[PDB]
RNA sequence: GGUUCUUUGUAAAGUGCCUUCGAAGAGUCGAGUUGUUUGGGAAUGCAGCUCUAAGUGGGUGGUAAAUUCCAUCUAAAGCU
RNA sequence: UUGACCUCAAAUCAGGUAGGAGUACCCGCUGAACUUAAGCAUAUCAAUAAGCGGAGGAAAAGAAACCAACCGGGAUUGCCUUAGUAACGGCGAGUGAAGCGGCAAAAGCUCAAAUUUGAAAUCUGGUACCUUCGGUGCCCGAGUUGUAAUUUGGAGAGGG
């Protein structure tokens, strides 16, 4: 974390008394609030599932995690969003199957 | 219009010529040759009081 | 100025110094760098070898400020002191009071070892030094201080 | 056509470049205009000093981080530590920059101190007073110049600890180059057996 | 408030509730005129966040525009030039269908100014848009300083000049290295980079 | 420079500490493909079509991808 | 039968507004070829000319989904420079920016997402009188499918 004082190496840079400024508010975007979590959860049961989400739920039960992630990456645009989509399709399947 | 009109001169060479021009004002033969009527002037350089 | 040009001397002469046979034309060999591999090839290989083809790996988005590292030799190292202050350090080549030279504030990145500094100890603050530049500074009694 | 032994030129004039020739004939005319504009603004805002007080900041990149220059504006933490608000500071000729952050104590201390001379050298006229005359000073930068810090002293003792600074540089970059390899090796050496 | 639920509901475009609503609404817009006045926004949440106020002087129009590429309007596909410009079919208009929608509404309602616009529906043949317009002559707009900026003459036909949201997006007006060609306008950037700057004392 | 309106105010605003919070833009981002454009090179921007988001999230970090971090801003609304 | 509401109409209804000219400069669309490559098709000319739409005294851009990788800078624009460079290109002809640095000028902000809910507190128009770029009272209307106050991320809000 602290600089080494020399011009090359792992932590190259001038050693300076650090200050750790106060965290900003803009650095909080995306963070879920109590109200917004309530609205997004309520809308999910009002609106239901998308046709591709129904497919991912079926593929998770039938073809496994890897095939579901491959189809999710095709439907979405990225492998990272395919994980988050398969992760919360697992959550819906977990809640539906239980009780 | 984009013909070169102004000419760059080195600052030290501009100063060089200015110092030469000042020193040439003290030579009465050069002043006489330049066309000035300093034939009956008391002395060159001509220095007058600050009251002027 | 125009009055000193050969165009003034070519007045009265038919071809203006361009010849009656050659008969000065628009672009007899092509324009610009035309035919560098075909009809101007000999001129290229004679005077610009290496022109055609590719050389090593590319560098997308090169920032020359990364590679800023002005080099300073040891024979110019003592020029970083002002000259009136410089003489009283050359006399009394002593430790416990040695000139501190910040080569960064003078705008240098690496100290190189062209060599033959005087035998006066000198404190050198340098971002980089060559191995031999370090040998000659220590041989004079000084030390190289690494900074960033 | 390629000719005798001359360097290869790259004169980019194969477009209609004569339609976009800007000759700065107005260079003397524009200089008079800016001086008239500066004199016009000075009379308009008299006795305010024609510009805002700016902080001292470290220049970025490794080529220029040896210098300090004038920044855009003081940070919210700098104005706070000088005992005034950002909204009020903007009204007495202080430049406030909300997006700059302070991670350097000496830059912050210099800028906080910089704010303290400025408040001690200006007088704020009353909003409903008699406004005593104050013989307008035209420049705030020339009244509060930016000064480079003193990195070290003129002369001191030679302290040679046998470090071999060149060898220090060689080992420092060698440690960085082979750290990732030496971290796989440490990972597998603990995992094996 | 309810505008947050409307915002989260509008996002799930493939739910059964919105598949029905978009099917019924796309039929209604085909049976109406290509440009027609809307009595109210069908997306009051989206209109609000684009600056629509529910007061006198704010007008919503609805418009549909033909989808697809811009076929080159040359006779019989014959271009007279080099083969690099012989393309006719797969050529794309440089402005969004939203931008074309804004101009056609703006020409129809030349007494107003286009503020913003938003997608409402689409089928294979059309994309459907609702355009927010503000009346600069209405006294409710001329006072109330939050919106009287658009009464200035400099804001006549922002949609024709690309000053709206989709107009600035298609012009490329964004910060950073990705938009070096288009930050302050690419024609001004090109003019500056293709200008010979000659000083009195030549550098 | 001055001259009235002086209930032209508990009306406005700022300043300290604790606690609970902290809503922040969707056929949009992003992705594929096609065309165009750029110095932008496994793709710089733009546009058509298809898919189509999340919320310690999203974008960017000028070589595609996976894994682990780090840095930096806060888009998809607006004025000057 | 009657009274609403929603949507859509009509009027030489009351008051407005648009067109067109100019178009040097400005914001976009569309878009060549002559030319260069000693031929020529990619390329170049050129993201130019012509064509089309739209403004102002400037326009546009503009207060970061920025640059960076530093001890970090800090809206936009323009000048000097970076730099004929990194890079692109039958890697041919040719093309070709950006960061930093120094200057000129400097200026900052506004909405949407929050229950005023013990008070739609908001606004157009008509009419009457005035101290008439407007004000006051009254009335009709708009508006709760949200007009005001309060907050815009730098924060800020509730409570104490
Ligand atoms: Mg002869
Ligand atoms: Mg003859
Ligand atoms: Mg002849
Ligand atoms: Mg041959
Ligand atoms: Mg061609
Ligand atoms: Mg000049
Ligand atoms: Mg936002
Ligand atoms: Mg085109
Ligand atoms: Mg091209
Ligand atoms: Mg930073
Ligand atoms: Mg009428
Ligand atoms: Mg333009
Ligand atoms: Mg040819
Ligand atoms: Mg030829
Ligand atoms: Mg081009
Ligand atoms: Mg033209
Ligand atoms: Mg005009
Ligand atoms: Mg001006
Ligand atoms: Mg403007
Ligand atoms: Mg603007
Ligand atoms: Mg901001
Ligand atoms: Mg900047
Ligand atoms: Mg390319
Ligand atoms: Mg080009
Ligand atoms: Mg307040």
PDB file of C-alpha atoms (C1' of nucleotides) in Angstrom, chain A residues 56 60 65 68-70 72-73 76 78-90, chain F residues 66-68:
ATOM      1  CA  UNK A  56     -32.955 -21.152 -18.351  1.00  0.00           C
ATOM      2  CA  UNK A  60     -30.875 -25.748 -15.083  1.00  0.00           C
ATOM      3  CA  UNK A  65     -25.274 -25.252 -14.989  1.00  0.00           C
ATOM      4  CA  UNK A  68     -27.704 -22.912 -18.917  1.00  0.00           C
ATOM      5  CA  UNK A  69     -24.812 -20.436 -18.723  1.00  0.00           C
ATOM      6  CA  UNK A  70     -24.036 -20.971 -22.417  1.00  0.00           C
ATOM      7  CA  UNK A  72     -27.732 -17.219 -20.989  1.00  0.00           C
ATOM      8  CA  UNK A  73     -24.544 -15.803 -22.526  1.00  0.00           C
ATOM      9  CA  UNK A  76     -27.539 -11.761 -22.855  1.00  0.00           C
ATOM     10  CA  UNK A  78     -21.621 -11.378 -21.660  1.00  0.00           C
ATOM     11  CA  UNK A  79     -20.381 -14.250 -19.541  1.00  0.00           C
ATOM     12  CA  UNK A  80     -20.571 -12.083 -16.410  1.00  0.00           C
ATOM     13  CA  UNK A  81     -24.258 -11.285 -16.962  1.00  0.00           C
ATOM     14  CA  UNK A  82     -24.879 -14.954 -17.781  1.00  0.00           C
ATOM     15  CA  UNK A  83     -23.624 -15.847 -14.296  1.00  0.00           C
ATOM     16  CA  UNK A  84     -25.845 -13.303 -12.559  1.00  0.00           C
ATOM     17  CA  UNK A  85     -28.831 -14.463 -14.605  1.00  0.00           C
ATOM     18  CA  UNK A  86     -28.211 -18.155 -13.866  1.00  0.00           C
ATOM     19  CA  UNK A  87     -27.529 -17.286 -10.211  1.00  0.00           C
ATOM     20  CA  UNK A  88     -30.931 -15.686  -9.677  1.00  0.00           C
ATOM     21  CA  UNK A  89     -32.695 -18.291 -11.795  1.00  0.00           C
ATOM     22  CA  UNK A  90     -31.210 -20.730  -9.282  1.00  0.00           C
TER      23      UNK A  90
ATOM     24  C1'   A F  66     -11.272 -17.149 -18.703  1.00  0.00           C
ATOM     25  C1'   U F  67      -9.888 -16.428 -13.137  1.00  0.00           C
ATOM     26  C1'   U F  68      -8.448 -13.075  -9.199  1.00  0.00           C
TER      27        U F  68
END
